Amino acid sequence: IVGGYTCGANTVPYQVSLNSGYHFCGGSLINSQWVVSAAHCYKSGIQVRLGEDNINVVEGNEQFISASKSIVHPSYNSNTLNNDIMLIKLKSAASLNSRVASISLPTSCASAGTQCLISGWGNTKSSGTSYPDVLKCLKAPILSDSSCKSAYPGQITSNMFCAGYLEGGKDSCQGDSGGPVVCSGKLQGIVSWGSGCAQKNKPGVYTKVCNYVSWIKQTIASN
């Protein structure tokens, strides 16, 4: 997260870290057994880390649960990034409490202009690479599809939206992929891609979760 702020320990209790020896992506806990992330975050042997604040220090609220299944959307396209969504089933159910809690799925899509909370342990620099220890947060509005398509001609599908600031300076970045974009208490986006981070006229692009609510429900049922 570039241009954000320290969230505060466990203030985003649905935020998880995906770890394959190191933190590489975020995710969002949607019930005690399932996490939403990005399809491009798929790897074999993912360990989900819940209840994290400082990802480098054991603080006493962590649950480390390996993925038993990582169900990528069957129509994910790694070239266009369309359908960039994945469901991770935990090998065992997480214990829910004040610091580890699920986030509600949307019942309807969000609208341009709505403010959302984006969070993660990704790079905090628009130039160079940093690795924050504690979770970072950013308030950012959903941008018009017109400005999104102007920023990314030929690349924006119906399953994507832009959010952030065309002026630059505030964005998600490498290491934030798969994490939440929460708007009015609903998980409306997944950190997906952008041209660099926090660059002028290159806002972050996010998977549009509201188009996948049915798929999420059927995948939970199938597994």
Partner: protein, 32 residues
């Protein structure tokens, strides 16, 4: 995504056939 690299060939696993570069120690092919 965060994937460290020394050359872009190290990014093949996460970047697949996408064009990009290994820069500032990490894979850069737009995905976060």
């Amino acid at each position: 995504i965060l994937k460290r690299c020394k050359t872009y060939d190290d990014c093949k696993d996460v970047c697949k056939a996408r064009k990009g570069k290994c820069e500032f120690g990490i894979c850069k092919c737009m995905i976060k």
